[PDB]
Design a protein around this nucleic acid. Structure first.
Lengths: 40, 49, 55, 161, 43, 100, 177
RNA sequence: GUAAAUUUAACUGUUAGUCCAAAGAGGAACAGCUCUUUGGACACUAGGAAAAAACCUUGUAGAGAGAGUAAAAAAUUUAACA
């Protein structure tokens, strides 16, 4: 759903493509230390 | 998640339904408009770079 | 006590009696019972919702 | 006595759906500020009980709350007991209010922390393809690495305004 | 130390609902005097 | 004014975007049932020289009539009321896993 | 909601009684609504293995309205099982013989083709003409809206509405009519 | 644009063609029929077309209680004034 609308906004057709939802880190250490980059 | 919300968070799900209904109405108004008018408040899309 | 409902740990009898006493201490009026919802009342599997009203 | 585009009322004269008039943008913008302020005061005064949130973790969305367990389907390069922050919160909800990200809520607004309590592997998963041979002795078994996370806490900060 | 066997759900919660679990009356409006369909007040 | 949905059931929904426009705020307090929309609790319900007798209202009924009574009372078919053999009875797990 | 576990489970899976009026309604549209309610497909807790169907009560089944010529054209066929036992009757013929047959068959076809179907039919209560047993009337919880909007007859139009509509043409004053 | 090709040293097995589209040549401008040619599919997967070797989508290597898609639902009721 919403693939064509997302393309109209310049986003990836799939929400799992490029953008903060996928590329940003999933987690970080509770003290604030950044996690290692994810494999994907 | 939406199915889980419908069962365990009915108030939150009604809000999501209200939000979807509002956005649907904004789409209807825009379709009638020629584009001269401004876009709906909820229609506005946040951009990322 | 994670996940446990209060009365599962604290066993009470006649909750309505305890409720009336606690409302009195708070000066609230005695609760009135009414039928908020009802379904299949004349069946083996009925459902009833009872609401307590103060004033 | 009629406009040039006047049509006598009939079944098909106008659309069947009821006409909807949306609020005036200027007036609605003022109302939105009042609602955001009201909800902000509830957060400031702690007028909420248990909170739940939707987090995006390991390509997945989890409807979680405090003390919950989630079984992640892979290893996480963390020792057991390590406390992490789940940084992708799509939604945080309370009894009386819900905050929605577009698509993710800001880190300032909501903090979700979890702990690794177990690192293990799944039960053996049989893989069997019916190729043109004696299949039984050719069954493959795979076990997938898993991580159990406990949701310690969900905290919202008064930063809506 | 728990048995390494099939786990039915990849999540466990003791508090699944914050706003109240859905029931058939969750989204039904109430009616004046709780009258039923085709019921007559002042019988 | 304008409401996306009716507000007479479940909760009253107020939708508001934040000034930055990156967050949607929903205020949804519960809608308490009005006292008027409720019914009063239904009140439940001689030469008797001899004591009242607790006569047993337990009447024997044959399998066919008994199943017909059970099926009508619970609005089911007759099949579920028949027994099954030992093979299926013993197969059933009497210590099933329980989640909360 | 802070209910006790057993009461909470009872409320969530409780059976609801729905009332449906069949006057001047097409059977299929009545059947489509009844099918969903009889299966529990209208509940967010729906699962096929959960027996979450609801009760559906349909009145005025004798006053259903078929669109088109389905009264004559629509044929219901059955076979007794004996040589020459094939019987074919029209919807009109079946309706006179059994006022609830048409709605019942329409619902039966829509329900899933599995062993749960006959159980779902037990929760279907079809009544020909506005009479419902008192016991069933006391169960009723909600009345579902009629799927088809019944058009008003010419006589049923109020004078204000008749005046509000314009006179499109000028009839010749010398015409007999 | 691509990454394969030839040669040398050894060696083994498969190969009795079905349908679809196209062009011919024989039958009857029949056959799920005869012959040849071009391409495709079928002994490698899956989705769809009612069931479905041959049509369409898609290629095939695992786990997921995530997501975007592909093919993918048949239409139609047939005049006249004196």
């Amino acid at each position: 759903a919403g693939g064509q609308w997302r393309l109209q906004q310049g986003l990836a057709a799939n929400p799992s493509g490029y953008g903060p939802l996928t590329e940003l880190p999933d987690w970080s250490y509770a003290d604030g230390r950044p996690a290692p980059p994810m494999k994907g | 998640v939406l199915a889980d919300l419908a069962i365990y968070e009915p108030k939150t799900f009604k809000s999501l339904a209200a939000l979807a209904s509002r956005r649907r109405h904004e789409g209807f108004a825009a379709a009638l408009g020629d584009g001269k008018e401004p876009e709906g408040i909820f229609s506005r899309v946040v951009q990322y770079h | 006590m994670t996940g446990k409902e209060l009365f599962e740990m604290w066993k009470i009898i006649n909750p309505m009696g305890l409720l009336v006493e606690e409302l009195k201490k708070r000066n609230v009026s005695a609760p009135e019972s009414r039928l908020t919802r009802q379904s299949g009342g004349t069946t083996a599997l009925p459902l009833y919702f009872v609401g307590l009203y103060c004033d | 006595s009629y406009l040039p585009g006047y049509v006598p009322k009939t079944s098909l004269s106008s659309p069947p759906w009821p006409e909807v008039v949306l609020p005036d943008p200027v007036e609605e913008t003022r109302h939105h500020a009042e609602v955001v302020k009201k909800v902000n005061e509830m957060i400031v005064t702690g007028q909420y009980g248990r909170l739940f949130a939707v987090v995006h973790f390991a390509s997945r969305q989890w409807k979680v709350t405090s003390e919950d367990l989630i079984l992640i389907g892979n290893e996480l390069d963390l020792a057991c007991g390590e406390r992490i922050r789940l940084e992708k919160v799509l939604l945080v909800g309370a009894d009386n209010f819900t905050l929605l990200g577009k698509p993710l809520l800001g880190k300032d607004l909501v903090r979700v922390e979890a702990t690794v309590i177990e690192k293990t592997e799944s039960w053996p998963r049989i893989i069997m393809r019916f190729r043109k041979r004696k299949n039984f002795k050719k069954k493959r078994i795979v076990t997938t690495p898993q991580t159990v996370l406990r949701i310690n806490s969900i905290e919202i900060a008064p930063c809506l305004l | 130390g728990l048995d390494v066997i099939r786990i039915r759900k990849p999540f466990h919660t003791d508090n699944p609902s914050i706003q109240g679990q859905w029931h058939p009356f969750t989204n039904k409006p109430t009616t004046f005097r709780g009258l039923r369909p085709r019921e007559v007040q002042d019988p | 004014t304008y409401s996306p949905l009716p507000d007479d059931y479940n909760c009253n929904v107020e939708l508001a975007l934040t000034s930055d426009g990156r967050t949607i705020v929903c205020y949804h307090p519960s809608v308490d049932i009005p006292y008027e929309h409720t019914k009063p609790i239904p009140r439940p319900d001689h030469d008797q020289v001899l004591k009242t007798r607790l006569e047993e209202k337990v009447e024997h009924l044959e399998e066919g009539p008994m199943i017909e009574q059970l099926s009508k009372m619970f609005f089911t078919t007759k099949h579920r009321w028949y027994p099954h053999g030992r093979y299926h009875r013993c197969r059933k797990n009497l210590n099933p896993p329980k989640d909360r | 909601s802070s209910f006790s576990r057993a009461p909470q489970q009872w409320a969530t899976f409780a059976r609801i009684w729905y009332l449906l009026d069949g006057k001047m309604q097409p059977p299929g549209k009545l059947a489509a609504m009844a099918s969903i309610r009889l299966q529990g497909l209208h509940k967010p807790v729906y699962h096929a293995l959960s027996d979450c169907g609801d009760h559906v009560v349909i009145m005025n089944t004798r006053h259903i309205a078929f669109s088109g010529n389905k009264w004559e054209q629509k044929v219901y066929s059955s076979h007794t099982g004996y040589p020459g036992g094939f019987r074919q009757v029209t919807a009109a013929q079946l309706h006179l013989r059994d006022p609830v047959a048409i709605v019942k068959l329409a619902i039966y076809g829509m329900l899933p083709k599995n062993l749960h179907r006959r159980t779902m039919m037990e929760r279907l209560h079809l009544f020909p003409d506005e009479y419902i047993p008192e016991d069933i009337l006391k169960n009723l919880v909600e009345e579902l809206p009629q799927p088809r909007k019944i058009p008003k007859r010419l006589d049923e139009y109020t004078q204000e509405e008749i005046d509000a509509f314009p006179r499109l043409w000028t009839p010749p004053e010398d015409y007999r009519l």
